[PDB]
Every structure is written in C-alpha cells, then in structure tokens.
Amino acid sequence: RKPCNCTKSLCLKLYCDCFANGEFCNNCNCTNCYNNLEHENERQKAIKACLDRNPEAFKPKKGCNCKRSGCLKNYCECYEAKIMCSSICKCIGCKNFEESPERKTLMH
DNA sequence: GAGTTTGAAACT
DNA sequence: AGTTTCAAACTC
Ligand SMILES: [Zn+2]
Ligand SMILES: [Zn+2]
Ligand SMILES: [Zn+2]
Ligand SMILES: [Zn+2]
Ligand SMILES: [Zn+2]
Ligand SMILES: [Zn+2]
C-alpha cells in the first residue's frame, strides 16, 4: 500500500515493510530492489533466511521494547497499531496504557 | 529538504 | 546480550 524507500536492504529484509508484509514492491521508492519478479532466486533465498531466523515471520497478519518514546509516538509498534501495551511489552517509561493521562491528552 | 531520533531486525 | 544497521518517524 504505502511506498517503501529502502536503499541498503534491497527490500529483502524485514526492515522493508513491503517485504515484511509478504508483498512484491509496487510503485515504491526503493533503490536496488530485489523484491520483485526479476530477482526471484535471490528473493527466495532471503525469504528462507528470514524464516529460519523466525518461523513466524510471514505468519498471517509480540510487544515493544521502547525506551525513549513513552510509547506515545509511532516509533512504538503498539502505539502505531493504535492499541495498548501489554504484559509482554518490555517498555520503559510506558505511558501507553488505558488510564494514562498523557495518552488521553494526546488522544484529543 | 536536511538532520536527528528511534527501536525492530540484524549481526556478532 | 551487546552492538550495529536500517528505514521510518519526527523535528526543524
Ligand atoms: Zn523496501
Ligand atoms: Zn517496497
Ligand atoms: Zn523495493
Ligand atoms: Zn512501545
Ligand atoms: Zn508495547
Ligand atoms: Zn509501552
């Protein structure tokens, strides 16, 4: 959906949101893109290396480790997904919980 | 547009 | 676990 602007990763790593969502890049702004039909062999390699690192990498779709955002900035994957942090999050200084004032203020 | 900040993903 | 890399979020 939204264009990636990768240069260094070739869009063959999870730093690339297009590749992380199991898509070919389309109309993106990436450089040296391998996330496409023209690089099928090398792309397949990246996929399996990506997968044996974590077998759930491309599972149909746990917790943040934010230090400085307070989890009220879109650096927090919880906040970006517009959901609350949970017990599994290893946040520090988390202000992204139900009864949080700052969260409520930033909500309006 | 440039430069800084951030934390997941990667690497050692 | 500590460190580096990376592309996006953010700030100016
Ligand atoms: Zn990309
Ligand atoms: Zn892309
Ligand atoms: Zn790409
Ligand atoms: Zn967070
Ligand atoms: Zn969280
Ligand atoms: Zn949090």
Residue numbers in the entry: 522 to 582, 597 to 643
Give excerpts from the publication:
The conserved MuvB complex acts as a switchable master cell cycle regulator, promoting expression of cell cycle genes during the cell cycle and maintaining repression of cell cycle genes during quiescence. LIN54 is responsible for directing MuvB binding to the cell cycle genes homology region (CHR) of target genes. The DNA-binding domain (DBD) of LIN54 contains two tandem cysteine-rich (CXC) domains that share sequence similarity with tesmin, a testis-specific metallothionein-like protein1920. We show that LIN54 uses both CXC domains to recognize the specific DNA consensus motif TTYRAA.
To understand how LIN54 recognizes CHR promoters and the molecular basis of our observed sequence specificity, we determined the crystal structure of LIN54 DBD bound to CHR13 at 2.4 Å resolution. The asymmetric unit contains two LIN54–DNA complexes that have nearly identical structures (C-α root-mean-squared deviation (RMSD)=0.33 Å; Supplementary Fig. 2). Consistent with our NMR data, the DBD contains two independently folded subdomains corresponding to DBD-N and DBD-C. Both subdomains contain a CXC fold, which we define based on structural similarity to the CXC domain from MSL2, followed by an α-helix that contributes to the subdomain structural core. Within the CXC fold, three Zn ions are coordinated by nine cysteines, which are present in loops and one short α-helix. Electron density corresponding to the 15 amino acids linking the subdomains is lacking and there are no observable protein–protein contacts between them, which suggests that the subdomains are connected through a flexible tether. The subdomains both bind to the minor groove of CHR13, both on one side of the DNA helix. DBD-C binds the 5′-TTT half of the motif, whereas DBD-N binds the 3′-GAA half. The protein–DNA complex is stabilized by an extensive set of backbone and sidechain hydrogen bonds to the DNA phosphate backbone and by insertion of a tyrosine from each subdomain into the minor groove. The most striking feature of the LIN54–DNA complex is the interaction of Tyr536 and Tyr610 with the minor groove, where those tyrosines bind both halves of the CHR consensus symmetrically. Tyr610 binds the TT step at the beginning of the CHR consensus, whereas Tyr536 binds the AA step at the end.
